Amino acid sequence: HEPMRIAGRLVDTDDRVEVRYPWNDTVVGTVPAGRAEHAREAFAIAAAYQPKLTRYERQKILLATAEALAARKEEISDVITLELGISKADSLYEVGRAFDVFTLAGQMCIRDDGEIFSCDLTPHGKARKIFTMREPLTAISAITPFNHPLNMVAHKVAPAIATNNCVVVKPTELTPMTALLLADILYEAGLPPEMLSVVTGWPADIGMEMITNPHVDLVTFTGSVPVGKLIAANAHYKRQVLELGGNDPLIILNDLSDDDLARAADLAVAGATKNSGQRCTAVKRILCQESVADRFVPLVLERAKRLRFGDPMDRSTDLGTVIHEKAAALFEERVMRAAEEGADILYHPGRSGALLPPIVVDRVPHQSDLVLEETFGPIIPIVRVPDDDDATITLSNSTAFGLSSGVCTNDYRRMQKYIAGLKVGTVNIWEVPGYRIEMSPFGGIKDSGNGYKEGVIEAMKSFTNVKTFSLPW
């Protein structure tokens, strides 16, 4: 049982939202069914407080938070696993990412990206210099999804702190406890409590306030397309940073040797199953050129079969559950539907509630739901594509999504052709689409995002207003 954290105060309601462990569907916790008025109060506190932390003080808070994450990683990952159902291996990894987010944000605090312009440049010129600086917003609204209960909150909160913003976070009702815990760690690390509130509740009660509150200068949201579009419609005249799904390919080109196909098979399996496949940039389509598919697929099958799936709290489990039974069932349905359309299921030890095995399916039709829609689970689906790069690129670009991608090849000419031709935010050569550092520009186009970049550096710019001033010179 965990109250909301509203500027460092514990705030409860009578009604509760129950949090269930997807492994066995038991209640592992409860948080308040907060209402608009709670969000409203959090935003008023955020608006009224004017942070005065020096860059040194910000760095010290952010680095202390990193140290606390590392020190408490076992405890934090337990909370993640118990709420989300991913393996301890995956949740421990997630704490490591949050540790990087806070560390990198702390280190970026010393960096001033101000610019200077000389004005004697044209016939309209003057003896004068223009200088730029950045200032924080009134308040920032952060709405986070279930797939990274810790790291998604870190990515929105760390850059806010580093820029002297005040943020209010509404985590998903499915995995709210991790966020509440992160808030406690931040207060303990010395954050002025007005800079952070974490409120909880049903979208129907508190969701709209997060979007429309008059103090909110910026809404940063990560989650699904439908919820994303709704937000974009309802948050008028607010800056919006919306990251919606992906449907990202790992592309296997026909120049690879058998040793390379094996390394690619490693990437395909890891990319498709890490975090139970619950990543906007998970491998959701393995596009394998026809002439190597016969050697490639077996290598993939063999690796999938090595994966231990089961009890998420067992430290030797690789693959835990997906978010719930209904999602798992939907994913299995899409598999079955694809098999009826010609697909060849090579490995499917059977689903158990929310626990989905790393199902390997070959010869998936590219227009079947399994790969055309976003399938947010640990399916390993190989689509066989022509030994033609133009046709492969056209196919890769044929979905509503455009986030990341991975391409395995040794031919530079083809590398650069894919880099130029894939309609995505990121193209990784010889890595999964999921690969990034926590501070590189991140974001998609098309239905994957509204077109603004994220990651620690771009988030920090995004959470500020640039002010210019000029002086006689």
Ligand X SMILES: NC(=O)c1ccc[n+]([C@@H]2O[C@H](COP(=O)([O-])OP(=O)(O)OC[C@H]3O[C@@H](n4cnc5c(N)ncnc54)[C@H](O)[C@@H]3O)[C@@H](O)[C@H]2O)c1
Ligand Y SMILES: *C(=O)[C@H](O)COP(=O)(O)O
Site residues, a copy of itself (CB under 8 A):
96-97, 100, 103-104, 117, 119, 121-126, 128, 130, 132, 217-218, 228-229, 232-233, 236-237, 239, 242, 415, 419, 424-431, 435-443, 445, 450-453, 465-472
CB of 222 to ligand X, least distance (A): 7
- Nearest-Å Rg of the Cα atoms of the chain is 23
Count of other CB atoms within 10 angstroms of residue 248: 32
**Under rule CB under 6 A, which residues in 189-218 are in contact with ligand X?**
203, 207-208, 210-211
Q: Pick from a copy of itself, ligand Y, ligand X, none: which does 434 bind, CB < 5 to 8 A by kind?
A: ligand Y
* Amino acid sitting at position 392: T
φ/ψ bin of 351: left (φ > 0), alpha (ψ from -120 to 50), beta (otherwise): beta
Q: Of 115 and 290, which has the nearer Cβ to a copy of itself?
A: 115
Q: Of 200 and 464, which has the nearer Cβ to ligand X?
A: 200
For 135, phi then psi, to 5°, come to -135, 150
Calpha distance 435→432 (Å, rounded): 6
Count of other CB atoms within 10 angstroms of residue 461: 14
Q: Pick from ligand X, ligand Y, a copy of itself, none: which does 243 bind, CB < 5 to 8 A by kind?
A: ligand Y
Q: Are 433 and 268 within 8 A, CB to CB? A: no
Segment (H or E) for 19: strand 16-21
φ/ψ bin of 391: left (φ > 0), alpha (ψ from -120 to 50), beta (otherwise): alpha
CB of 471 to a copy of itself, least distance (A): 5
Q: Of 93 and 347, which has the nearer Cβ to a copy of itself?
A: 93
Residue 145 annotated as binding? yes
CB of 429 to a copy of itself, least distance (A): 5
Q: Are 43 and 213 within 8 A, CB to CB? A: yes
Residue 357 annotated as binding? no
Residue 288 annotated as binding? no
Q: Which residues bind ligand Y (CB under 6 A)?
A: 147-148, 151, 222, 243, 279-281, 434, 436
Calpha distance 243→246 (Å, rounded): 9
Q: Are strands 116-118 and 128-136 parallel, antiparallel or unpaired?
A: antiparallel
Judged by CB under 6 A, which stretch of 89-97, 113-121, 139-147, 189-197 contacts ligand X?
139-147
Q: Pick from a copy of itself, ligand Y, ligand X, none: which does 431 bind, CB < 5 to 8 A by kind?
A: a copy of itself
> Measured on CA atoms in the order 121, 126, 129, 135, is the torsion positive or negative?
negative
* Amino acid sitting at position 299: L
Residue 243 annotated among the catalytic residues of the structure: yes
Q: Which of 2, 41, 243, 332 is catalytic?
A: 243
Residue 317 annotated as binding? no
Q: Give Cα 381 distance to the centre of its chain.
A: 22
Calpha distance 240→246 (Å, rounded): 18
240 forms part of the interface with ligand X (CB under 6 A): no
Binding-site size for ligand X (CB under 6 A) equals: 18
Residue 148 annotated as binding? yes
Q: Of 234 and 410, which has the nearer Cβ to ligand X?
A: 234
Q: Are 13 and 35 within 8 A, CB to CB? A: yes
CB of 211 to a copy of itself, least distance (A): 12
Q: DSSP letter string over 97-155? A: HHHHHHHHHHHHTT-----EEES--STT--SEEEEEEEEE-S-EEEEE-SS-TTHHHHH
Segment (H or E) for 403: none
Q: Of 207 and 434, which has the nearer Cβ to ligand Y?
A: 434
**Under rule CB under 6 A, which residues in 163-192 are in contact with ligand X?**
170-173
Count of other CB atoms within 10 angstroms of residue 429: 16
Q: Pick from ligand Y, a copy of itself, ligand X, none: which does 435 bind, CB < 5 to 8 A by kind?
A: a copy of itself
Q: Which of 83, 109, 166, 280 is catalytic?
A: 280
Q: Are 31 and 152 within 8 A, CB to CB? A: no
Among 29, 106, 145, 249, binds ligand X (CB under 6 A): 145
Q: Pick from ligand Y, ligand X, a copy of itself, none: which does 173 bind, CB < 5 to 8 A by kind?
A: ligand X
For the annotated binding site, the residues are: 97, 144-146, 148, 170-173, 224, 279-281, 374, 436
Residues that bind ligand X (CB under 6 A): 143-147, 170-173, 203, 207-208, 210-211, 223-224, 227, 230
Binding annotation for substrate: 97, 148, 279-281, 436
- State the catalytic residues: 243, 280
